[PDB]
Symmetry: C3
Subunit: 436 residues, 3 copies
């Protein structure tokens, strides 16, 4: 239960042992915010194991004004680490320093008890560093130290998982427009949530297969790919002028593949910047609902296109697409979640969501899974901007000769709107170009 950090521990005196040394800071007993604790150390005579209370041996630390905090050197073993910190904190100790009797610097080894009151930092030091202090304290030399935990303490091992089911269609009416306005408004929140490790978002899509009585029929050719293995209704429903379901299944699988690629590289928030820019740059009315326009966004955001077209695979082949198969399989009820039948469905913590699609409504439902003192900044009724403008200018237009870019980070996420220079509203096509 100790995370190893090298630059955290530093010794100021004695000068013979001065320097930076590695230590394994504890997960509990330290504050979330980063900081610094400077103090001296004391090695007790009795109860060096800290397995019993220090009041029995009449050992107190008695912090006084102007005095350096009293770090305690504890011999590892005979009792749990959390109990050692509790005994020292009762005596008034500022922090504990456990020296493992084992020589391995990497070894780092419970039940929910009354340990939340522990507020003193804990650390595990190498046996070499521990015995170096024991010798300095026996010679009459003070050992003054500095401890910089510094880490904001992410603790994102168990967070909130939300899965959204959407469609890339934009002409089906107000239902499709409500989702786009939601994705554009929720992008800024979801990005900072995933960047802070507070959320794990997985976008999902819905496809069906051609029935056996309709196999090779004309309706199965217009709405389905991979020989009728993955389907979707026609957007316009006119068919003669509509884009047909195939183009929808392709762009859905493309957006799913953009997530499959970015999730492996460690940037799933890029999926949000892709689907929002997809609705802005590649519409169906302008006939820009093509693969060429979609690949332009993939290139503008630095997304790897080879990994995407490989994830997509053959659009027309009797083989099965692994992502669309995993998506149709993801629709089946996996325990308490139940089956996913509705098209705009959101599932938070493996239980579905029926409230309104408002951003604040979705947020208020997600902040219920978080515990107190761990709620993110966004959850605590605080509004913040994104930070995508700093890399590749967010994939927005830019003129370095004038220190002027089309990128702008907002609460809705990065937006590549043409900038206004000297009062002149530049009119251009967002990132592709901008001109007065």
């Amino acid at each position: 239960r100790f995370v190893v950090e090298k630059n955290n521990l530093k010794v100021t005196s004695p000068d013979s042992i001065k320097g930076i040394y590695e230590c394994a800071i504890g997960n509990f007993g330290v504050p979330q915010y980063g900081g610094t604790l400077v103090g001296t150390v004391v090695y007790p005579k009795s109860n060096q194991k800290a397995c019993k209370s220090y009041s029995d041996f009449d050992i107190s630390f008695k912090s006084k004004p102007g005095r350096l905090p009293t770090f305690v050197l504890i011999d590892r073993g005979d009792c749990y680490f959390t109990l050692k910190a509790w005994i020292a904190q009762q005596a008034g100790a500022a922090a504990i320093l456990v020296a493992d009797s084992k020589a391995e610097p990497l070894i780092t080894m419970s039940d929910a008890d009354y340990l939340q009151n522990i507020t003193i930092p804990s650390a595990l030091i190498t046996k070499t560093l521990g015995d170096s202090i024991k010798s300095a304290l026996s010679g009459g030399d003070m050992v003054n130290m500095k401890l910089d935990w510094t880490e904001s303490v992410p603790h994102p091992d168990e967070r909130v998982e939300y899965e959204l089911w959407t469609n890339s269609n934009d002409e089906c009416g107000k239902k499709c427009d409500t989702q786009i306005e939601f994705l554009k408004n929720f992008k800024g929140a979801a990005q900072i949530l995933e960047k802070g490790g507070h959320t794990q978002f997985t976008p999902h899509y819905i496809t069906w297969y051609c029935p056996e009585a309709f196999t090779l029929s004309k309706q199965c050719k217009s709405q389905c790919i991979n020989h009728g293995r993955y389907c979707a209704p026609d957007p316009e429903q006119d068919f003669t002028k509509g884009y047909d379901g195939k183009d929808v299944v392709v762009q859905n699988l493309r957006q799913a593949c953009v997530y499959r690629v970015m999730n492996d590289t460690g940037k799933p928030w890029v999926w949000w910047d892709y689907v929002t820019d997809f609705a802005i740059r590649c519409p169906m009315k302008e006939k820009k609902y093509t693969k060429e326009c979609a690949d332009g966004i993939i290139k503008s955001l630095g997304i790897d296109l080879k990994k995407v077209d490989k994830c997509i695979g053959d659009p027309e082949a009797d083989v099965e697409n692994p992502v669309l198969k995993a998506e149709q399989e993801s629709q089946i009820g996996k325990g308490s979640r139940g089956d996913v039948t509705i098209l705009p469905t959101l599932v938070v913590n493996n239980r579905q969501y029926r409230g309104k699609l408002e951003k604040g409504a979705v947020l208020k439902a997600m902040c219920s899974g978080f515990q107190e003192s761990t709620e993110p900044a966004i959850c605590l009724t605080e509004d913040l901007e994104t930070n995508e403008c700093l890399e590749n200018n967010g994939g927005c237009w830019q003129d370095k000769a004038a220190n002027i870019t089309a990128c702008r980070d907002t609460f809705r996420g990065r937006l590549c709107e043409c900038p206004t220079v000297q009062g002149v509203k530049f009119v251009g096509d967002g990132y592709t170009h901008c001109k007065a």
Copy 2:
């Protein structure tokens, strides 16, 4: 308990019965957000009434990957509708389709029970449409359908009612200024609240009558109208230079009448745009506290002036004004509310309000009447703008030759401030004109 919607139901196959048909979607079991559910239908052999559990007859629906959802055709009668949906949802059904044995398409007919877990959509179809499916399922033809509830589910039948008591005076000190800053700041919130059906606001005003010992005295002539039937103190209290109480009673009755007219047409939020623009365009210091200036706002906002001057009636006649009589009557304690004596008094859900006049304080008090999963967007710590700019340009100045208007929708509501074009701050009188 079913709302009738025509375009919601559509049949894709068989082609002999394809088309859009009317259906009565259920109030419960459907999500608030709008969406689409595409699936096929199944007519059970036993328990067609859905009055008993399907596990007794060993009937399950067994949803599988890639399979269309399983709509169920239930014969109406012998049990309640909510119990039919509960039995099907246990078997894994996606939605139920009740076919009324009665031939009337309009007939649509409990106690609070464990029905909140019902999350499958419910619908009532005509007996013609129901028997058309029974014949298609007996011939061996699949019936694939699409159901678009789509409605955001307003459910505004029982909402929050708040009544505010104000005065149009603007020179009585800081007390009158605190109300105007409140009305200007709360306008944007109250408008979106009433537009979404979440609130019913009624503005109220306070008037007294001349005592019998003071009848026809000079003080009763300055402060009272309708031969001393409705009164108000002098604003300035100097009388010689003050506007006298009569002008206050007239403008109060005028603002009340603006609400009486707009409430009948279905736009009570216009009262907010009127009283805020009244404090901006018709002040007492500029001597614009006249009927002419007030009628200009009535014309700018498209308010019907005939219905207002009829509601006002004769300002000086021994007859009684019905609105001011209903207002003086509205002051009397009608149950738990008690009498309304304080001038800036707010009553929410027929119980008064003592907290501070801050917008967030008034909001937090109103969001207590709303239930969870039904709180409006404004209540859920989300800040949004209004939408009055789209009609008549909100009654603000506009130059179509430059695509430039003086209207601006904000969180405080529509505001007719002069726009800034090309860096040049146009200086003008708001809506009346604007010029660089």
Copy 3:
């Protein structure tokens, strides 16, 4: 339990007793928001002491439409004031008027009981004014009055106290930058909190003393002042190029002294404007981390410099600094708070704070000490701007010949950024000058 206010009470009739008179409005029974209550008075025959229920003597006040509210004249004594208001409110009275039988106008004299339902205003009037009404009611003359409590009811006697421990160093890494971004972001919230009397903030700083074995050593000369009585580690830790701990102890003591001076004059929020402008105008990289640059901020904000340099005293003398002694003493555990060892430590209501340093996180922790219906505007999820721009232009640059200033009040507090005029972004050194 009555606050004396002169202009609150005014009499309209009879004309022989008309005028403004002093009265002692009650702390309870009145609303927080300011307003006005106009009504007539009634002196009961029996139970003039209001010590028994009015239903026994069959005395009711019976408010009717158009009728003036019924103020009650109660003789002081024989029972508590709160019980008198409760008896009158049951009879339907609008407000009570207690006339002290004692002739002193200043005398104004419990356990938590069921008195929260009391919503009628209460007031204590002089015996002269009380007997003047008794004579007017015996002669058959109506006494019409007006009562303007008006006060927002601050009640800031017992509020939230938060103490923050910071350091003026800006090159120690990200730990020092996290604090500055926090102080810049929290400045706007903390200022409005202290201005409304809702918070008492005391900034604190951490210093140590030179050990006896290190007295007069070179390391004690670089990090410590007053002959090694107050210390701090070197910022850069290089010493050869670092500013040395002495400069840090001096600027910390200077910032503490700026608070010690401003707290006595009644403007502790100026400390926030000082430390934020200190990080903007006097950095260490530009070598502006000098006393001269720091005194410029003291002069720009109108802070009294004599009281600051006196609080600082002799930077190098064997005497002890009273503020730094009170600061080192403030570090010791004073009850439930415990010792303060961590450098960025915040203590709210004498109990420490472990959550993240986010503004919303700190706010949510502070709003827990406030009771309901008394939470400030900032606490109730409402965002507001400051009001420092109105005095000395917030100590920002200004050009009166163009109505253009560099001051701007925001949610982060006053900021002296160069203004943009006619689209031209003026580039200057904030307040010191600004030019296109």
